[PDB]
Subunit: 121 residues, 4 copies
């Protein structure tokens, strides 16, 4: 049983906390990013997502959206919860980071991509 | 003012419907995909997402997750709502489609990527 | 028979020219990008790539690298040559644009992604 | 001075060997993948690429194409050569793996994406 509910930290030092997952797979959380110039104001942003219920799975796929505070951007993450090495949980994700452009001719360059591995904190 | 609420169709023939967007940017919807072997059972899946409120924008960025029915997979979409040509709305998105693997050594191959352009239906 | 050799232009207005493809699938070319601030100096960059020979195909897959002039960046493209509508050739590609960072802690953000459709010029 | 010439192995167990890089940044090599069902026939495929010369760099960006044997597919990799921890070289890459489809209506699903970290062997 690989469960998203809990405290996680990514290979970049960002922390997220994901709350309860309901009957329909939905969850909510907060994301505290490690990626910005130091603000005395704590950079928290909400997140919302769903995990796949088809078949229970116990290593389900999932997705979620972060709507960044103090930024026009959105990141989406998707991945799967794995469980191994006497029970250590890992989320393997890939993401897209969408920036905002003000002219559709710059759309082509508005999207970044990479990976994040999240482990229990 | 570029608004996600409404009926959209993608370059593949999939239809989605997105409901009201609340004060915190959240929305819900359904996704009817054009991509599967014909089921007499209508393939609808929910979606959940958020759009970026920072600054009103009127061409905001956004993300959402689709949790596919009759499949172990999840797609995440992210993009921006544009408005042009005497007022025609377009969503330019990129997506990741995560499949489910049963062994972490196949993780590397579980993620697809592409684009979708969504126009009003 | 879908052939890469020739003159192509992308949905952004960039032009490329690809030369002969040899027995081992290799080719060379030039890329004239539409994407930069107007230089009186013509922005041409070489490209090098290969296409897949396994089975002849006539709609083969392929990849190539552009090593951008006056920039520290590299783009890689990959795709397939299609042929349709009384014989119109199209290259459907996706790309990654790698920027240069000077500190490995910014690596995560150095890669962009999108699509390009190339048609005969 | 971070140099691509040499022997590398990836987080999946694949080995590649990259030869000399010339004045124009070009190189050639072989790729021995860890990713297939065991063939008594050694799975080697050529690769061809370029690295960015603008400014010498010593941590340049680069790209290359692998044209897979016994497969219709092509992978493209792009990244940057880093150097750290008393001199340990690392290539951080992202890739696209293009499969072959026989009908352009399946194009949307033909491309995978992920990362590879390559270290000296
Ligand atoms: O103002 C901003 C804009 C974008 C951001 N992206 N963060 C990410 C994007 C992709 C993957 C991980 C992260 C992270 O912060 O951990 C953070 C703050
Ligand atoms: O059983 C499944 C599994 C995956 C699916 N992906 N659909 C998509 C994935 C990416 C972009 C567009 C679509 C779409 O259906 O329009 C659909 C049904
Ligand atoms: O100085 C630079 C840096 C990056 C560039 N990327 N061009 C591209 C990247 C991806 C897809 C298409 C293009 C293009 O120019 O058509 C061009 C000039
Ligand atoms: O027949 C095939 C088809 C595709 C392959 N892709 N390999 C890869 C694709 C992306 C990243 C790393 C690898 C690898 O083999 O290390 C290998 C053999
Ligand atoms: C995340 O939490 C850990 C442990 O509480 C802490 O060391 C780290 O500074 C936190 N990171 C951020 C970005 O808040
Ligand atoms: C989407 O809606 C349009 C118009 O109602 C219709 O022609 C099309 O068949 C629908 N597609 C799907 C996949 O339901
Ligand atoms: C590409 O070629 C076409 C036709 O020759 C021309 O109109 C266009 O300006 C060229 N674009 C660039 C960026 O050189
Ligand atoms: C790569 O080389 C190492 C060391 O020579 C070896 O252990 C490994 O089996 C090789 N892998 C492949 C896929 O050839």
């Amino acid at each position: 049983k690989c469960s998203l509910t809990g405290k996680w930290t990514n290979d970049l030092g960002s922390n997220m906390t994901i709350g309860a997952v309901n009957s329909r797979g939905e969850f909510t959380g907060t994301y505290t990013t490690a990626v910005t110039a130091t603000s005395n104001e704590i950079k928290e942003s909400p997140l919302h997502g769903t995990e796949n219920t088809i078949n229970k799975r116990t290593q389900p796929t999932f997705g979620f959206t972060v709507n960044w505070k103090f930024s026009e951007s959105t990141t989406v993450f998707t991945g799967q919860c794995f469980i191994d090495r006497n029970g250590k949980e890992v989320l393997k994700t890939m993401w897209l980071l969408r920036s905002s452009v003000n002219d559709i001719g710059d759309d082509w360059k508005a999207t970044r991509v990479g990976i994040n591995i999240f482990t229990r904190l």
